Design a protein around this ligand. Structure first.
Ligand SMILES: COc1ccc(C(=O)O)cc1
Ligand SMILES: [Ca+2]
Length: 123
């Protein structure tokens, strides 16, 4: 879920509060998304959004009422390395992977403050 993703991003980037630094950034980082990504970080979020859209189409995810933002899964952080647990079922695992790839993406690309709270009229 959302809380897991927060800790997952702090695992890769120890000095930030993901819910603040990465929320409402560009056209995709944050609830929703549309238009052409403004930068790679925004592209990281785009991919993450597609990943979620994909997960929602899994027979295994449809059975449960939990939302990708509200579905708790298991993972660990160790030596700043993220590991999705094998105790996770199909749906959770898929989501866990979506969040893992996004966290790493976040930590490998530039951050442009100018894009924080971007005017959704650029999307
Ligand atoms: C806490 O950071 C994020 C970043 C991107 C996504 C999103 O697009 O909703 C969610 C949370
Ligand atoms: Ca989004």
């Amino acid at each position: 879920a959302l809380w897991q993703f927060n800790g997952m991003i702090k695992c890769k980037i120890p000095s930030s509060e993901p819910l603040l630094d990465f929320n409402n950034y560009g056209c995709y980082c944050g609830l929703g998304g549309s238009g052409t990504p403004v930068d790679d970080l925004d592209r990281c979020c785009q991919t993450h959004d597609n990943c979620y859209m994909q997960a929602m189409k899994l027979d295994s995810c449809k059975v449960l009422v939990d939302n990708p933002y509200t579905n708790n899964y298991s993972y660990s952080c160790s030596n700043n390395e993220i590991t999705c647990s094998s105790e996770n079922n199909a749906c959770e695992a898929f989501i866990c992977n979506c969040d893992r790839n996004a966290a790493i993406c976040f930590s490998k690309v530039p951050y442009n403050k100018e894009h924080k709270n971007l005017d959704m009229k650029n999307c």
